[PDB]
Design a protein around this ligand. Structure first.
Ligand SMILES: [Cl-]
Ligand SMILES: [Cl-]
Ligand code: NA
Ligand code: NA
Length: 129
C-alpha cells in the first residue's frame, strides 16, 4: 500500500510513534518519505547482501529474517516479509526497537541526511491526526 502523508502520520500516531524516544511524528513521516516514498512494499538490496524492507526500510542484517543474509540476526523476531504489510504494526514495533538501540534515528541514514535539523513539522501540517 502507498500511504498518503496525513494517512501515514495518523497510523504512526495510533501505533505510538508520536514523540517516541523524543522523536516528533514529523521525523517519522519524513524518514518514511525518503526511505520508501510511503510504500509499504518497498525493498532495496544493500551492497553487503542484506535487504531493506517496508515503509521504514528496515535492514535484514540485524532486524528481520529473510533467509538470505548470511550471518545476520533477527532482533525484531519477524520474517522481513511482515514488514511489507499494508498493516504497519510490525514495521512500527520493529522501528521502536531500532530507535532505542543507542543511536536514535541516526540508524536511518536518509533521516540523518534529509530530515535531521529540518522543519519536520511540515510533514504533518494540515493533517487531522
Ligand atoms: Cl531508499
Ligand atoms: Cl539469513
Ligand atoms: Na543465510
Ligand atoms: Na536520541
Amino acid at each position: 500500500k502507498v500511504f498518503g502523508r496525513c494517512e501515514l502520520a495518523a497510523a504512526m500516531k495510533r501505533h505510538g510513534l508520536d514523540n517516541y524516544r523524543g522523536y516528533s511524528l514529523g521525523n517519522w513521516v519524513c524518514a518514511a518519505k525518503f526511505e520508501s516514498n510511503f510504500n509499504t512494499q518497498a525493498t532495496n538490496r544493500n551492497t553487503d547482501g542484506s535487504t531493506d524492507y517496508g515503509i521504514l526500510q528496515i535492514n535484514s542484517r540485524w532486524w528481520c529474517n529473510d533467509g538470505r543474509t548470511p550471518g545476520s540476526r533477527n532482533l525484531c523476531n519477524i520474517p522481513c516479509s511482515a514488514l511489507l504489510s499494508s498493516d504497519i504494526t510490525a514495521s512500527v514495533n520493529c522501528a521502536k526497537k531500532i530507535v532505542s538501540d543507542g543511536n536514535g534515528m541516526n540508524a536511518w541514514v536518509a533521516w540523518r541526511n534529509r530530515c535531521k535539523g529540518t522543519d519536520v513539522q511540515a510533514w504533518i501540517r494540515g493533517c487531522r491526526l
